Design a protein around this ligand. Sequence first.
Ligand SMILES: CC(=O)N[C@@H]1[C@@H](O[C@@H]2O[C@H](CO)[C@H](O)[C@H](O)[C@H]2O)[C@@H](O)[C@H](CO)O[C@H]1O
Ligand SMILES: CC(=O)N[C@@H]1[C@@H](O[C@@H]2O[C@H](CO)[C@H](O)[C@H](O)[C@H]2O)[C@@H](O)[C@H](CO)O[C@H]1O
Lengths: 144, 147
Amino acid sequence: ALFSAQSPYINPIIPFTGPIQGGLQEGLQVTLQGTTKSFAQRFVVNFQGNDIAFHFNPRFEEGGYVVCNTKQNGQWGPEERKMQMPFQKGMPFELCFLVQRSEFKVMVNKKFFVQYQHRVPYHLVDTIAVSGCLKLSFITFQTQ
Amino acid sequence: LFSAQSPYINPIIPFTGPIQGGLQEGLQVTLQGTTKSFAQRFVVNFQNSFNGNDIAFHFNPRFEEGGYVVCNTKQNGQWGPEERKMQMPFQKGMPFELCFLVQRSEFKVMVNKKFFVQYQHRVPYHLVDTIAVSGCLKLSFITFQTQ
Ligand SMILES: CC(=O)N[C@@H]1[C@@H](O[C@@H]2O[C@H](CO)[C@H](O)[C@H](O)[C@H]2O)[C@@H](O)[C@H](CO)O[C@H]1O
Ligand SMILES: CC(=O)N[C@@H]1[C@@H](O[C@@H]2O[C@H](CO)[C@H](O)[C@H](O)[C@H]2O)[C@@H](O)[C@H](CO)O[C@H]1O
């Protein structure tokens, strides 16, 4: 049973940048409903001026895969690549990030896709940022 | 840290050997060895001999394309989606300490005393009673410690 603390962002214009009230919290669920463009190459979801705690980057290249990473001081860390594309060009998607004690859990269309353990603490993240070849219907914030 | 199994000393690669009482929560499997200096890739397979062919955890460092490690599972002769760590913690031609710490929800992998990668269980871990090692390396020993 999930309750919303923060009001959702409805039909945000891509590229979008918006604050997460009170910052990330344990148990917080961030759901993105939207659509992948028909000729999509890439899109980006960043939890983060220039320091990305968690970089979520699907790529319609080399068979289809998703990059998870962290930017610290303008430097990308080692990549954790999941060699499978859970999205589809032209098709709507549900993307769910769950903030757990030691990892983000990532769900795509109600099925687990990947986890990424925190390299920097989640508490210091107070900004979601979305860009690339997609449109969004909404972004929700829910904490049980 | 106690020996639930007596160490394999200088096992010849390719290697295949039983793990005593299968994988358990808190078990550390250490591979002390050296990577060849002309090394393409090498394999550490944790597997179940009751479906031989299958591989529960496939750990495969590849000295290619900048150097990365592949972690995967093989079920019914099929490979699942790969989890690639894009970083090579083994130096070509050099010695290494490779630790596999079995935990409730994942394998924890340590290289040269540094945490390297994790791998969440895709098939139940209790099924693994075999460790297999192959490719461009040589092994000094394989120890077994319980945490
Ligand atoms: C294809 C490309 O332009 N660069 C590749 C790198 O991709 C960058 O990865 C970071 C996150 O790690 C971020 O997504 C950035 O927007 C990408 O350009 C990278 O995957 C590697 C180098 O580490 O290969 C580059 O070709
Ligand atoms: C590199 C190669 O020869 N084949 C590529 C696949 O690699 C296989 O991967 C499995 C484990 O997932 C295992 O290591 C086997 O020995 C490899 O042949 C695979 O990495 C890619 C798909 O991303 O396609 C093959 O070309």
